[PDB]
Structure 1
C-alpha cells in the first residue's frame, strides 16, 4: 500500500496527529458519564470527569470536524480501566479523567466507552483514514498508600477482572516499595514511586508478562501507535524488551515522553530516542518553537540551530513527534498573545520534519496554564477559525508532498525575525517563509530555492499574509517584502526517479519481522533491499511499490545495519542507518554484581557476546550500572534486554574515562529465560 496509507502503522511522518484528552473533547454518550463526586458536566472543575468519550470522537470524525482539518491521526487518553476513586488531594477532589491511573490494562475505562466502543472508534477512524494512537502508561497503576490500604484503590492491579494484587501487602512484589522519587537521579526516578503512584515492578515476571500481553491485546484491537508514558521512569532495559515485544509481534509507531525544560539538553534523552526502539516527543523542538514564536526568548538563529542540530542528534529525526504545546505545558496561546503567533507556530510545526501533533483545541485558541488548566473542554467546534484553516491547508501536504513528510531542512534566508527554509526530498520541495515580527515587513533579497521556475502560489492562500513566489532560472526568487507576521508555503512535487528512503519502521526487530521502508522512487518492480551487504530479494520482499517496501529482516547476526534500497534497475537509495537487528526475542534480566568497588568517576558496566550486550566492546558496554535504590554500592544492578532462551557469555568491567578494567577469570555464562525475567546475582571476579 502507499506510504501515506492509513494502514501504515509503522511510520507517521506523513500524518498530522491531533492529541485528544478524551474526557475534554466531546461527550457523545451521556449514559456512560461518571456520577456523583467524580463528574462535573459543566467541566469547571478540571480534575473531575466532564464526560467526553470515544463516541464523541467518532462523532467528530463523522461530521467532518477532524477530517475537515486534515488530521490523519488522533492520539487519545490511555484506554484502559482506571480506578474509580475520587481522591481528595488537600481539598481538591481528583479523578482518573486523564486515563493515567490504571487498574486493569485489559479492560476499557467505561467513562470512555466499552470494548465495542473502542472497536467502533478504531473502525470509524480507519474508514476516514485516521490512525489511532493510544497512551499506555506501564510504569504505575494508581494513587496508593501501603500504610493506608483504604486510600484510593490501594494501587490494585487486576488482569481482566482478576485481582493480581494491591500495594499494601505485596508479598509477590508486583510493586516497588522504596519510597517516592525526589527526581535527583535517573535511577531514583526509575525505582522509587512517581509522586504516590504505585510503581510497577517490571522485574517481577508476572508484571512483565502481563504488560506485554496487555499491549498485544491493544495491538490486536487495531491501534496504530502507542505513546508510552513516563519513559524516564522505567528501566531502559525493560522498555527495550517491551519495544521488542511490539515490533516482533505487530510493530506500530511508538514514542514516549522524556521531559526536557527550556534549553536543557540531555544526552540520555537522545540515547533513548536513538536506542530504545521508540521515538520521543520532540521537546527540544517544542521548547525552541515556544521560545522563538511565543515567548521571544530566542530568535530565528536559535530556531535554525535547533533544526540543524536535531537533524544530526536524532538518528531518525523523521520519527520525533513535534508540537508547540501538549498536556504537559501551558497552552501556547496566552490571553494577551497575538493569535498570529499561534498560527505561525502551527504552520511551522506542520511543515517541519517529524510527526506533527496538534493539541486539541489549538485551532480554537484555547489558553490556559499548566495542569489542569491546559486540559479544559474545548469550547467550540467552529471550522472557520484561521487556525483551523491553517491546519486544513497545510496538514494534507504531509501526505501529498514527500519533501514535508521526509525531507531535509535547509535554511535559505534568515535574520533575527525571519526564517525561510526549504524541505527537500528528491525533487520535491517545500519552502516556508515566516516573519515573526508582527510590526516590520522583511525585505527578502537574494533568496535561492530548489524550486523550478514558476509563479508559486502560497498554499496558505494569503491567510497568513503570504505572497506568490516568482522563481526564475536557477531557483532564484524575485525579491519580495514579507508582510509583518507573514507566513507563506510554496511547493513543487514530482516523481523521484531514484530510490530515496524517507523513513523505516520499526527500527529494531528480530530476523523474520517485516519492516516498512517508505520513500519515493522505488518503482513498481521489485528490486533489492540491503541490510549491510546482505541482499534481500524475491519472496522475502513482502511488498514493493514506489513509495513503500515491506521486507522481512534477513537472518543476519544481531547488530546495527544500514539499509539501502536498489530499484529494479540497480539504482541505489541513500543509506538509512542505525537499524538494529535483534538476536531474537528479548527478556529483561536484572544483573547484580557485588563487591565492585570503584574509584571516583569509575562505574561498572556489562558486556557480553551478543549485540544486545555490545558484542564484547567496552565502548558499547551496558551501563553505567546502578547502585543506590534496589541494591547499594558496592553492589551494582541493571535491567538489560537480552535474547531470550539462550546462553550468553558476559563479563563486567569498570570504566573510568578511557580505562577499562575487566573482571578476571573465565567469562560468565547464563542461560536466559524464554519469557519473563531473571536475576543474575554474582560477585566481582578479580
Structure 2
C-alpha cells in the first residue's frame, strides 16, 4: 500500500477532512429519533436533536456527494452515549446533548446516532469509498452538573457499560474535581477546575485512568482511523501523554487535540503540547489568521506569511497541523456579501501545509454566527456551487502532488493584498497566487519560481479567475495581471524522485513498535532506515512508504533518515521521540519548597521522560494553587511503568538554578495504575 491509501491511518497530510455535525447532517433513519422534548422534527429549535444520524452519513457516502467533492476523511462528533435530560434554556426553550459532548457512558453508543452495528456500517462504507473516519472523544468531562443541585441535568453521572460509577454529588470515590469552575486565567486553573458547568473528570484517579484507556480501545476495536481529542488545554499534559501512549501501543491512529486559541493569542504551552504529547493539534494560529486576513479585515497578507513562518518555526511536525477556517464553535466563515473570500480561504487551506478540515456546509455558503446558529441543518447538496468545485479541483492534489502534502512553504511575492507562495518537495512544486482585493488588480513583476521552464495552466481552470503563466529557465515568470479576487494554482510533479521523507508517524514510540515513513523515491528494493545512526528492522518497503521496527536505542529524540538499496540518502525527519517503556501518569508532589518572586519549582530526573537531568528541559513550572497550595508544588507526569527513577527538584527564574541538596529521591513507578509520589524539599 502507498502513502495515500485509506489504510494508512497515521498520516493525514494527503487527505482532506470533512467535519460533520451528525445530528445536523442527514436523518437517515427516523425510527432512531428521540421522542418528546428531546426532538424537533421542524429543525428550527437549535439546541434540540434534529435526528441526523450515522445512516444519513452512509447515504451521502454511497450517493457520491462526499466523494464527488474529493473528501477523503470525515470527522464526526463523539459517538458515545450522551445524557437524555433536556436542560432549561431561556433563549431556545430546552438544551440537549445533540452535539455529543455530554457523555454518560464512553463504552456505549449514542442510540440516536445509531447502534454499534450502525457505527460498523459507517466505518465499512467509508473505507469502501477510501474515506477515513475520525471520532471526537472528550475525556475531560461527562456532562453539566451542579453539586448543590443534584436534580440539574443528570448530575454528571458516569456509567461503565451500563454500570453506574458515580455522579458529581456525593462523589465519595473522587472520580471528579470539586474546585469550582475555570476562568481561563492560568494553565493550572483551566485543568483542575470545571470547564463551564461540565463535571470535570479526575484522570489521576486510577479507576478513571483505566476506564478511559479501556473506553478508547472499544472504539479502536470498532476500526476508527483517527481521534480528535476535545479540550486538551483542560487536562494535564502528563496524563494525556500517558493516554496517547496507551492508544499508540494498542493500535496507532492519527490523533489531534483541540487547544483553543483566540486571535493573536500566544501560548507556549500549546507549542510544547504539539511537540511532546504524542498527538497533533488543530491549528488555531492558522485558522484565526486566515479569518483576520480573508474574513474580518484585521491583518494583511504580510500577517498571513508571518503566521506561516512562525508556525513552521515553532511546531516540530508542521505537516500534522490540522487546519480549518471555521468550526462548530466559531462564526460561520461566510457572513454575507461576496462569496469570493470564503472561496479564497478554502483554496488557501487546501493548498497549504498540514491536514485541511472543512466544516459541513461551507461548500453551500451556510451562515450563522455563534453556537448554535452555526449548527443549522445542512441546507443543500447542490454540487454546482463554486465552493464545492474549488474543493473538488484542489482536494485531490494532496494525493497527486507531494509538494502539497509534504512540501516546504516559501513566499514568492507579497503585498497587503497579494500572497504568492510556493510548496516544494524535491522537484515537485506547486505555486499559488491569491489576490484578496475584490476591486483592485496587481501587476506581478519580479516573480521567481522553482517550476521548470514552460507554460502552466491554472489547475482551477479559471474557476476563481485564474490564468496561465510562462516560466523561463532561470525561474523568472513573465509579467502578468493578478485580477481582483483571483486565485490561480500552477504545478509540476516530477517523473522521478531522489529519496525524500515527507512524514513519519507516530512521532512518539518505543523499541519494537512500528513507525510509518512516507514520501517519494525510496525505490522498490529494501534499503535501510536509520534512527540517528542506528538501523531499524524493515517490516515493509515501497517507493512511497516504508514501515520499520524501532531499534533498542537509548530513549530520547531521534532524527530519521532513509537509504535506498543503491545507497542514496534521504533528508532527515527530526524529533521522533523514543520512550523508555509503556507510560504511567504519576503525580509528583514536593513540600516546603519556598521561592522568591518570579522563581518556580521544576522536576528533573534520570530518565528521558524527566529530561535526563537537563535543567533547560526540566518539567514545569510546577503547579501550586488548586490540588495543593504553595509552598507545596505538584505536577502530573508521564513516566515509564515499573521503572525505578531518581529525581530532584530545582528552582529557577531568569538567572540561576538552585538544586535540592542531599541524595536523589527515588521511586518505582507503578506497573499499570496511576501513582502519587510525595517528598520534602531537601536543602
Q: Normalising TM by the smaller chain, what interval?
A: over 0.9
Query: Which residue of the other structure, out of 617, 629, 638, is the alignment partner of 2:626?
Result: 629
1:321-367 deviations in whole A, cap 9, x for unaligned? Answer: 0111111210110023x100010110000000010000110000011
Aligned to 1:119: 120
CA distance in 2 between counterparts of 1:543 and 1:88 reads: 57
CA distance in 1 between counterparts of 2:496 and 2:12 reads: 20
Question: Does the residue aligned with 2:298 lie in a helix, a strand or coil?
Answer: coil
CA distance in 2 between counterparts of 1:290 and 1:496 reads: 38
Aligned to 1:26: 26
Aligned to 2:616: 619
Residue 664 of structure 1 deviates from its aligned partner by 1.4
1:247-266 deviations in whole A, cap 9, x for unaligned? Answer: 12211111111111111121
Aligned to 1:418: 418
Aligned to 1:547: 544
1:29-59 deviations in whole A, cap 9, x for unaligned? Answer: 1111111111112221111111111101110
Aligned to 2:71: 71
Aligned to 1:97: 98
- Worse-superposed segment, 66-75 or 39-48: 39-48
Aligned to 2:573: 576
**How do 1:553-568 and structure 2 match up within 5 A?**
553-568=550-565
CA distance in 2 between counterparts of 1:229 and 1:496 reads: 41
- In the alignment, does 2:600 pair up with 1:603? yes
CA distance in 2 between counterparts of 1:422 and 1:498 reads: 20
**How do 1:310-325 and structure 2 match up within 5 A?**
310-325=311-326
CA distance in 1 between counterparts of 2:238 and 2:586 reads: 8
- In the alignment, does 2:264 pair up with 1:247? no
Aligned to 1:651: 648
- In the alignment, does 2:386 pair up with 1:381? no
Please identify runs of 4+ aligned residues in structure 1 that moved more than 3 A.
89-92
CA distance in 2 between counterparts of 1:176 and 1:440 reads: 56
- Worse-superposed segment, 286-295 or 398-407: 286-295
Question: Does the residue aligned with 2:183 lie in a helix, a strand or coil?
Answer: coil
TM-score, with length taken from structure 1? 0.98
CA distance in 1 between counterparts of 2:290 and 2:410 reads: 17
Residue 483 of structure 1 deviates from its aligned partner by 1.6
Assess, with a 3 A threshold, how the Cα gap between structure 1 residues 523 and 8 changes in structure 2: closer, same or farther.
same
Residue 552 of structure 1 deviates from its aligned partner by 1.1
CA distance in 1 between counterparts of 2:409 and 2:49 reads: 42
Residue 181 of structure 1 deviates from its aligned partner by 1.1
Residue 496 of structure 1 deviates from its aligned partner by 4.6
Aligned to 1:428: 428
Aligned to 1:397: 397
**How do 1:505-520 and structure 2 match up within 5 A?**
505-520=505-520
CA distance in 2 between counterparts of 1:575 and 1:400 reads: 23
Question: Does the residue aligned with 2:66 lie in a helix, a strand or coil?
Answer: helix
- In the alignment, does 2:445 pair up with 1:445? yes
Aligned to 2:265: 264
Aligned to 1:141: 142
CA distance in 2 between counterparts of 1:286 and 1:194 reads: 23
CA distance in 1 between counterparts of 2:597 and 2:356 reads: 43
CA distance in 2 between counterparts of 1:223 and 1:23 reads: 19
Contact 1:427–1:495 under 8 Å retained in 2 = no
- Worse-superposed segment, 248-257 or 473-482: 473-482
Residue 62 of structure 1 deviates from its aligned partner by 0.6
1:475-534 deviations in whole A, cap 9, x for unaligned? Answer: 322221112111011111114532111111100012111111111111111111111111
1:37-86 deviations in whole A, cap 9, x for unaligned? Answer: 11112221111111111101110011001000000000000001111111
Question: Does the residue aligned with 1:98 lie in a helix, a strand or coil?
Answer: coil
- In the alignment, does 2:22 pair up with 1:5? no
1:512-565 deviations in whole A, cap 9, x for unaligned? Answer: 1111111111111111111111112xxx21111111111111111211111111
| Contiguous gaps of at least 5 residues in structure 2 | none
Aligned to 2:289: 288
CA distance in 2 between counterparts of 1:242 and 1:228 reads: 11
Question: Does the residue aligned with 1:612 lie in a helix, a strand or coil?
Answer: helix
CA distance in 2 between counterparts of 1:423 and 1:485 reads: 21
1:248-306 deviations in whole A, cap 9, x for unaligned? Answer: 22111111111111111211111111111111111111111111111111111111111
Question: Does the residue aligned with 1:473 lie in a helix, a strand or coil?
Answer: coil
Question: Does the residue aligned with 2:459 lie in a helix, a strand or coil?
Answer: coil
CA distance in 1 between counterparts of 2:654 and 2:569 reads: 40
CA distance in 1 between counterparts of 2:631 and 2:301 reads: 49
CA distance in 1 between counterparts of 2:283 and 2:655 reads: 32
TM-score, with length taken from structure 2? 0.99
Question: Does the residue aligned with 1:357 lie in a helix, a strand or coil?
Answer: strand
- Worse-superposed segment, 19-28 or 35-44: 35-44
- Worse-superposed segment, 206-215 or 38-47: 38-47
CA distance in 1 between counterparts of 2:8 and 2:190 reads: 35
- Worse-superposed segment, 609-618 or 443-452: 443-452
CA distance in 1 between counterparts of 2:660 and 2:425 reads: 50
Contact 1:426–1:496 under 8 Å retained in 2 = no
Residue 474 of structure 1 deviates from its aligned partner by 2.5
Question: Does the residue aligned with 2:474 lie in a helix, a strand or coil?
Answer: helix
Residue 234 of structure 1 deviates from its aligned partner by 0.1
Question: Does the residue aligned with 2:67 lie in a helix, a strand or coil?
Answer: helix
Residue 658 of structure 1 deviates from its aligned partner by 3.3
**How do 1:126-165 and structure 2 match up within 5 A?**
126-165=127-166
Aligned to 1:364: 364
CA distance in 1 between counterparts of 2:248 and 2:508 reads: 7
| Contiguous gaps of at least 5 residues in structure 1 | none
CA distance in 2 between counterparts of 1:344 and 1:152 reads: 43
Aligned to 1:524: 524
Question: Does the residue aligned with 1:213 lie in a helix, a strand or coil?
Answer: helix
CA distance in 2 between counterparts of 1:207 and 1:466 reads: 55
Question: Does the residue aligned with 1:117 lie in a helix, a strand or coil?
Answer: helix
Question: Does the residue aligned with 2:329 lie in a helix, a strand or coil?
Answer: coil
Aligned to 1:206: 207
Question: Does the residue aligned with 2:587 lie in a helix, a strand or coil?
Answer: strand
CA distance in 2 between counterparts of 1:154 and 1:266 reads: 33
Aligned to 2:484: 484
Contact 1:495–1:520 under 8 Å retained in 2 = no
1:581-616 deviations in whole A, cap 9, x for unaligned? Answer: 010100000011111111111111111110000001
